Design a binder for this molecule. Structure first.
Ligand SMILES: [O][C]C1=C([N+2](=O)=O)[C]=C(C2=NOC(C3=[C]N=C(C(=O)[N][C]C([O])=O)C([O])=[C]3)=[C]2)[C]=[C]1
Ligand SMILES: [O][C]C1=C([N+2](=O)=O)[C]=C(C2=NOC(C3=[C]N=C(C(=O)[N][C]C([O])=O)C([O])=[C]3)=[C]2)[C]=[C]1
Ligand SMILES: [Mn+2]
Ligand SMILES: [Mn+2]
Lengths: 335, 335
């Protein structure tokens, strides 16, 4: 249901820019930040697209040319992938899984090198894909600092206070190539996803879909990522992926998506849609109330499972024995 | 390989008194307490039958007539079972499993009532089976106190000190009917099993046979007992019971069996062999050394599994959700 750009500029996107998947989806509500329904969704830990926060308004003019001049000469972390899927891996956990071979590489370089490398790929017509991820701090140039200070800190700080969240833990500038895919994963923090340039399709799954999405072992370098290849799902290894249902939206410049903590998200930059720019705001979650409500939420059950996997790895002295012990505990007893 | 009683009194037992099972066994060593091999077995947490401890020497004269006179008028806990299998259940845990129906009953009665009830069953030729289990304390009569004080406390106290064990946690007098079976289970304490009257076949399994013996969930009333019916094993529910190998011995009057903590034991009173009397000594285990050796023993892995089941039940607020969460953690991730 592509929205129409103002001034009769045509549809913002067409469906042929969206990749094809096996599961059904329904739309995330697009609302005004003044609408009480938006506040109710955020308070209830459910996603919403806010259309008028002005959260990153001064950055709406950002593009590669403007950024290259004013971001200054600093090292920016650039990730590379041969396929459209970008596979992040925790280097610290690579020791436990010696047979793991990384499929993405990170290279620190200046902004001009990133722009030239991106243009070079297009000039060659190649299939190498790139992804820049860098924190918005004082190291950037003065003009970017002015834009950064111009974010709607009043709106987001009030959101932090009202929801009882913790501290702003990270702020990442995010520049990607058309067709790039960040595969399904979850984060342990609250996120506001502020779209700046281009369009990104965001597909979210509630925390109770844990059984349908098959995350890696906690000690694996791909911890918190789904094991299921969304392009070629292995229903024999992952039967419950046949039951997964998602919440889908396409975010464009000016939109902010609240991704609640522990919610799975799959994010792709629209095919043939140009480069994308996003700024992400992550906040530590609110502390658990000491008065535990025993129904118990899915995200709390996820936290329990993570803690058990972590404790078991420490107690056995080797995270690779977690699986055999768990199977010993369950087979013929709980299954 | 039935031993011959002294004075040409014939074989102590014949094989037709031993029940038939599906698994193979090998013999537990029968040794003198002065033999260094016996000390090495106890120190290494392996079973041994000691033939000459004199641990319960003054009780070797005990029988039903002598006990009835001198034990005095007190209440003794008598357990009843319709079948030869005695199913102990933890009454405290019965709340968690409402669908559990107990198969044994406990009734407090005086010693004369126990003797008459036992004789009554034989007079009727009935199939009701009975089992008396009572602590050796000051409540018993003066003559039983003299016998109790006459146990080889010097030998057993030295064993407690040498092995670093904790305190004598329980001392149970154990009187049963011929054919009685205590099904396979494990205890979390060190045990000396002092046979007094009649013969008992003891079948022990090392702690690493956990996977072949399928204990109940920790929160189940039958916690620490094997789910496998040794008389009719369900190989579909319990495939690894086809791999179980045990250590077997027949203990008679004067023998003491060390049952190391966490070792599975199945104990039966020989068919057509008369009543049996045993006194059990349980000691708390030695504290774990702070210098953990990372190979890690099977009994330590059992303790870890028990702790995880207990913690999970508390965290979820309902022990019946332990199974579904464990399966959620494992399916498609560790299995
Ligand atoms: O505990 C502090 C803390 C820190 N820290 O140390 O400051 C860093 C992180 C963090 N590290 O990485 C990400 C991340 C997550 N998700 C995405 C994503 O989903 N991108 C798709 C798209 O299109 O937006 C991402 O790009 C980065 C977050 C989290 C917590
Ligand atoms: O933590 C203190 C503590 C206490 N406490 O509270 O003092 C009681 C027990 C205890 N409770 O029951 C038994 C028991 C175990 N095993 C057998 C058995 O295997 N019998 C077969 C046979 O033929 O010997 C048994 O008869 C009783 C032991 C354990 C620890
Ligand atoms: Mn994320
Ligand atoms: Mn026992």
């Amino acid at each position: 249901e592509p929205r129409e750009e103002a001034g009769a500029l045509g549809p913002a996107w067409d469906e042929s820019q969206l990749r094809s998947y096996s599961f059904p989806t329904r739309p995330i509500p697009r609302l005004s930040q003044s609408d009480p329904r938006a506040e109710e969704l955020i308070e209830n830990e459910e996603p919403v697209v806010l259309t008028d926060t002005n959260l990153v308004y001064p950055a709406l003019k950002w593009d590669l040319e403007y950024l290259q001049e004013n971001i200054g000469n600093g090292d920016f972390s650039v990730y590379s992938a041969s396929t459209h899927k970008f596979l992040y891996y925790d280097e610290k956990k690579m020791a436990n899984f010696q047979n793991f071979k990384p499929r993405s590489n990170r290279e620190e370089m200046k902004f001009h090198e990133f722009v030239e490398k991106l243009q070079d790929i297009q000039q060659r017509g190649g299939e190498e894909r790139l992804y820049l991820q860098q924190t918005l701090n004082d190291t950037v140039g003065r003009k970017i600092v002015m834009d950064f200070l111009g974010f709607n800190w009043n709106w987001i700080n009030k959101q932090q206070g009202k929801r009882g969240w913790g501290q702003l833990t990270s702020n990442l500038l995010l520049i990607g190539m058309e067709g790039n895919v960040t595969p399904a994963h979850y984060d342990e923090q609250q996120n506001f996803f502020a779209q700046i340039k281009g369009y990104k399709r965001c597909i979210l799954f509630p925390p109770d879909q844990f059984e349908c999405l098959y995350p890696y072992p906690v000690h694996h370098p791909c911890d918190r990522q789904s094991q299921v290849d969304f392009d070629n799902p292995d229903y024999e290894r992952f039967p419950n992926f046949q039951n997964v249902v998602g919440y889908e939206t396409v975010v464009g410049p000016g939109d902010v998506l609240y991704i609640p903590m522990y919610w799975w998200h799959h994010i792709e930059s629209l095919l043939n849609g140009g480069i994308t720019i996003t700024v992400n705001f992550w906040y530590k979650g609110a502390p658990t109330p000491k008065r535990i409500e025993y129904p118990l939420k899915a995200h709390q059950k996820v936290a329990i499972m993570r803690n058990i996997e972590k404790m078991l790895g420490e107690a056995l002295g080797n995270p690779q024995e977690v699986g055999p012990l768990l199977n010993t505990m369950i087979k013929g007893r709980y299954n």
